[PDB]
Amino acid sequence: SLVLMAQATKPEQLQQLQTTYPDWTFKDAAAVTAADYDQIEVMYGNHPLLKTILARPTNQLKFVQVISAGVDYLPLKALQAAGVVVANTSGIHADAISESVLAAMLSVVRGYHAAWLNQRGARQWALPMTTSTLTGQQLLIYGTGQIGQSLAAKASALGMHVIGVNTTGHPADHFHETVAFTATADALATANFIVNALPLTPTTHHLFSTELFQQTKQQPMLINIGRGPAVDTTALMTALDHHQLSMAALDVTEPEPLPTDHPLWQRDDVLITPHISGQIAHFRATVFPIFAANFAQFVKDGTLVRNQVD
């Protein structure tokens, strides 16, 4: 019956909740009272009452949603003993950046980019191109950190085959296969999409350049959400010129900002976005949908859908 609202919400978030769940009380932690305690089944945000409530062998707490990635000082043993499920707020930035990559890939293969050139052009009722789907294609990602892995998870759920490149070719969550930097020739030959998500180091500078491009055989699309200088701008333009690559999307450039007279801008086969991929809204706006989704599922069947903490 009661949710303890320890995290503040926009008035509108609270309204959604109260009308979507007219049999639930969403109680501001200021106005709570000890008569409420055994009523609280869910907590949005960690709060001092967590301790009080768990002390009562008559509490009914079932789900705590914390609003930061850190679960350290939480009474882990009590929560497990009482069977309380907990979720946190990780993956937010990495989720947005992954959506930007999917966006680049989908707008190309589903024909939105070509359709737009058509709409600003001849406005024919057909495109000069054949559409294709992500399902069934190969995605090669350099960087198997948190970002690489969240991109992998989404692509994989969309039916993509996902290969990742890291130092020693060790395993990583959601990637179907991983390879070491020295071991990439085969993955480069079968890739439909190559995504750079690496940090800049001295040995990954101009990593995307003539030799790399020449090892590709499916005329893949190149996407850069790493750093500008990973990619040799000149080699890139010539790889596109000789159809070694079909398309590029760069959310970072060398130099950056990309000056307005740079020839990259004038291409129809390079989509420049001004380093936006990782920009997310304010915490109030990103954290609440996490709770709203976990609570809807909790209400439906007692389980969580996002960021369940083990």
Place this chain on the structure above:
Amino acid sequence: SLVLMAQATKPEQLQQLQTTYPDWTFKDAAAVTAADYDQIEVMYGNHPLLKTILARPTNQLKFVQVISAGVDYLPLKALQAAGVVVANTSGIHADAISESVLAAMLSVVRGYHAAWLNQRGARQWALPMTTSTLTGQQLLIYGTGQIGQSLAAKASALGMHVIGVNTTGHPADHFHETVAFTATADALATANFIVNALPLTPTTHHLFSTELFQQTKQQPMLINIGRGPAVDTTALMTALDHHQLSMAALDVTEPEPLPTDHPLWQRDDVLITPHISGQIAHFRATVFPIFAANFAQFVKDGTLVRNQVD
């Protein structure tokens, strides 16, 4: 060890297989022999040998992939008794159309459409817009048939909340909630994206028009992959004019083709695609990735990832 290749493959599909799996034999069904029979663990395509093989209480058949949606005349009882897993080829068209909807939505909220106007415009290092993510947003779909459901599955896996509209508000696979046509006011008020995937009938003609648009409160994006006349072109342009809607993507129009002097084309807030969303490649090209994915997973751990037939 052996796959019976009863379905033909492009020479290149066969190559991929033989090099990705150098310890497996991919045997053309013409060249098979009864010495092979108990070697065959997988069958790509249904074949007369299915019967022969299953007759031998010494066969090792484990996985049959059929290359059409129909599983009728298949020895269902034998397959179950021998523990054989089977997958088919449903959902192909519906998968592509769903990818087109995701593409429309992602290219808008991740800023690709605005980035392109910027690239053909001032080429600033910023966009006049704030990006947002699909994760956490509400998708309202009219039509809970096979297409609606495959769109629902993908959106839902991307963290969207998905509501569907059908005649009697009955349940449908993957939709979090469904409503009847007469019961849509609330869903329309909280929708971030509205997708039409209905068939044309006399009472769904100009369904997307002034009254409907006026019931929305989140300034949602409208997407039409149903039929042109579901949407009143005039009302649409005026709803966008008064910011009742943020954006539209129409893959169908009234009239269609959309004549080159139609004012819809000149808008920056409507993405016209020329009825491409449902166009898929030739069967050889759509069916093979289904087998390739189910076989990779089968090899990994004996399970299937796509279209497992119960």
